[PDB]
Write a protein that binds this ligand. Sequence first.
Ligand SMILES: Cc1cn([C@H]2C[C@H](OP(=O)(O)O)[C@@H](COP(=O)(O)O)O2)c(=O)[nH]c1=O
Ligand SMILES: [Ca+2]
Length: 129
Amino acid sequence: LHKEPATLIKAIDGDTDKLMYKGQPMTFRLLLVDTPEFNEKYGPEASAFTKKMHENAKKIEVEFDKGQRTDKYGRGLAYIYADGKMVNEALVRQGLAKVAYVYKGNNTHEQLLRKAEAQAKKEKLNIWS
Ligand SMILES: Cc1cn([C@H]2C[C@H](OP(=O)(O)O)[C@@H](COP(=O)(O)O)O2)c(=O)[nH]c1=O
Ligand SMILES: [Ca+2]
């Protein structure tokens, strides 16, 4: 897999953003994770966390997996990195997202995120509290 450039257009919520990619505005849905919706518990904390990670980033990058790059809603499916740090993993590691939506062929970083989830759970963090 490889990282490609993008620039923030807008934070949206825990697991979606709006980025400029190849010069076009797109909504991205983070691979392999599920944040609570804003109206749910930890939803606001998840949005804030993702927002901050995106907004404080000097450098945003997009990393597609091997499979479909867009979902049925037209959202890009990617791992997103803020200054080299994966947002998808960071959310899980903090217990602000669950590993979810693991579809065969876009699951390269499954075991990395599951390891983060086990640690967040051990620490009884947020969703696991
Ligand atoms: C993460 C992800 C979600 N989706 C779709 C499945 C779900 O369909 P449904 O909308 O029919 O439930 C939905 C969950 O996204 P959200 O968690 O953003 O709602 O997005 C994919 O198709 N591929 C993916 O890799
Ligand atoms: Ca969600």
